[PDB]
Amino acid sequence: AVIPILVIACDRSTVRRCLDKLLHYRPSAELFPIIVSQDCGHEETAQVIASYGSAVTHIRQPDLSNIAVQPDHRKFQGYYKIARHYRWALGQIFHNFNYPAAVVVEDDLEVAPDFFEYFQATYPLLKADPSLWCVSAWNDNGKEQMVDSSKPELLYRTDFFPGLGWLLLAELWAELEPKWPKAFWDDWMRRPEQRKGRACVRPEISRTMTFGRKGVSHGQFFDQHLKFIKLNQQFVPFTQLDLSYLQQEAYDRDFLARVYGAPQLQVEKVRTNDRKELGEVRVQYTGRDSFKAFAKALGVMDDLKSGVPRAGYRGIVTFLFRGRRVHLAPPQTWDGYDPSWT
Numbered sequence: 001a002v003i004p005i006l007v008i009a010c011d012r013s014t015v016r017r018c019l020d021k022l023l024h025y026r027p028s029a030e031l032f033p034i035i036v037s038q039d040c041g042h043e044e045t046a047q048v049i050a051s052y053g054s055a056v057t058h059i060r061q062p063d064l065s066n067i068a069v070q071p072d073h074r075k076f077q078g079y080y081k082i083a084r085h086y087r088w089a090l091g092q093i094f095h096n097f098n099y100p101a102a103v104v105v106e107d108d109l110e111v112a113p114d115f116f117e118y119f120q121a122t123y124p125l126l127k128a129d130p131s132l133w134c135v136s137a138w139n140d141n142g143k144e145q146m147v148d149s150s151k152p153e154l155l156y157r158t159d160f161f162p163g164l165g166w167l168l169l170a171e172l173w174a175e176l177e178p179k180w181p182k183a184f185w186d187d188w189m190r191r192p193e194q195r196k197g198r199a200c201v202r203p204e205i206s207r208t209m210t211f212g213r214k215g216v217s218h219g220q221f222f223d224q225h226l227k228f229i230k231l232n233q234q235f236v237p238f239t240q241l242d243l244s245y246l247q248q249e250a251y252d253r254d255f256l257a258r259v260y261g262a263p264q265l266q267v268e269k270v271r272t273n274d275r276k277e278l279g280e281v282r283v284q285y286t287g288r289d290s291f292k293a294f295a296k297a298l299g300v301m302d303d304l305k306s307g308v309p310r311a312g313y314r315g316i317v318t319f320l321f322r323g324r325r326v327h328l329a330p331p332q333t334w335d336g337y338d339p340s341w342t
């Protein structure tokens with residue numbers, strides 16, 4: 001099973017940093033061929049990629065024309081270009097190279113030492129559980145003081161598609177390509193019409209980190225959140241672990257029981273670190289206002305996509321807060337997301 005790393009690039013020479021780390025950590029060239037798809041025609045970025053010679057396969061998006069945006073998107077042509085490139089690059093991977101799957105990595109991401117180990121261990125889970133539609137390296141709330149460094153092996157299921165270093169099966173591309181959007185591809189996949197209740201595996205500690213300060217999007221989201229996501233440094237031999245706990249029939253019984261079996265604690269008590277004998281608690285939210293207030297009070301990303309919170313699963317956001325395991329969760333009667341929660 002050959003799993004290619006598809007690197008998306010355009011006009012940043014710092015794709016160098018991305019490639020150096022991938023190539024440095026790659027355990028097998030044959031198992032993980034690196035295909036760098038470059039859009040934009042930026043000469044310097046092209047030479048940088050070319051300088052790797054046979055270590056990579058350099059392909060170039062063929063259509064550099066400007067894109068006619070809808071009336072509401074004058075300021076967002078960059079996003080149209082990203083979607084068009086993804087469509088072409090992914091089509092190359094699955095139609096031309098004909099690979100059974102691929103790990104998508106943008107040019108401004110640095111991978112952790114166990115990046116490949118992580119994906120070779122979770123690929124079989126993705127293939128065996130159809131309720132899963134991706135494996136992501138990203139923990140949306142993976143800031144340093146919000147993750148347990150003593151559990152770098154801990155993984156989770158999430159309804160919130162993280163992207164940022166993610167594996168998909170050729171089977172999924174078959175589903176998406178026919179209806180691929182003109183822009184904002186990641187938020188589009190977050191919609192239920194695309195997701196269809198499926199989840200991704202995400203880790204306690206991220207296997208990628210971003211340094212792309214300047215890019216298509218403006219730097220506010222990167223400056224206030226993305227730059228703080230910590231890169232895992234301790235190598236975990238995921239291929240030697242039993243990851244059967246991530247299968248739907250085990251996770252939805254065990255993890256949920258764990259969450260709703262945990263004692264409930266007032267958000268204020270958690271914030272000030274009161275009642276420390278409760279090493280694992282549930283902070284229950286009941287409405288949209290309480291969710292965003294409690295989220296903000298504990299330092300969790302508080303925005304919602306199609307009603308789903310960052311790293312949420314059945315509405316539950318799990319993270320570490322001042323050394324305490326916390327599950328910001330809805331009442332046990334939760335029964336599906338509400339896109340009206342914005």
Ligand SMILES: CC(=O)N[C@H]1[C@@H](OP(=O)(O)OP(=O)(O)OC[C@H]2O[C@@H](n3ccc(=O)[nH]c3=O)[C@H](O)[C@@H]2O)O[C@H](CO)[C@@H](O)[C@@H]1O
Pocket residue numbers: 008009010011039040078079081082083085086105106107108163164183184185186210212214215216217218226
């Ligand atoms: C951290 C985060 O959530 N980043 C997302 C953000 O991009 P973000 O705001 O991070 O913008 P970037 O500049 O990093 O561009 C994202 C990717 O698009 C490529 N690119 C850029 C310009 C262009 O004309 N052609 C092209 O192919 C870049 O090389 C890069 O690999 O929104 C994009 C969706 O719209 C997603 O793809 C990114 O994952």
Ligand SMILES: [Mn+2]
Pocket residue numbers: 106108210212215216
């Ligand atoms: Mn970026």
